[model samples]
Target: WLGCARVKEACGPWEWPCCSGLKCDGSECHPQ
Candidate 1:
């Protein structure tokens, strides 16, 4: 499934997935 969180958005493993081009850095979504 596509991620719900965008760049700079709050995220976690089971909380929110990072968008296609972003990465979840344990707390937020960042550019990969």
Candidate 2:
């Protein structure tokens, strides 16, 4: 499972956007 979306404290741990090769850049989750 993989995707590019937003991940913040509001989303919580269980609401992480990306699954693998993910990176938290500022306020976005994308491929590393």
Candidate 3:
């Protein structure tokens, strides 16, 4: 599996965590 995703990357409650300083919102990684 891949590691944490960067900003704007896809994400979900059961998906991978966001990259440092980023937050998972809705279904994507966004700025915190």
lDDT (tens digit, per residue) of candidate 3 on 1-32? 77788887898666777778787877778888
Ranking by TM-score: 1, 3, 2
Residues forming the 10-long window of minimal summed lDDT in candidate 3: 12-21
| Runs off by more than 4 Å, candidate 2 | 1-17
lDDT of each: 0.76, 0.49, 0.78
- lDDT head-to-head 2 vs 3, winner: 3
For residue 3, model 2's alpha carbon misses the true position, in angstroms, by: 9.2
- In model 1, the worst 10-residue window by lDDT is 12-21
- Per-residue error (Å), model 1, residue 15: 1.0
Error in Å for residue 4 of model 2: 9.4
For model 2, residues 1-32, the per-residue Cα lDDT tens digits are 55545443222234655555556655465455
> What is candidate 2's CA lDDT for residue 15?
60
Top TM-score model: 1
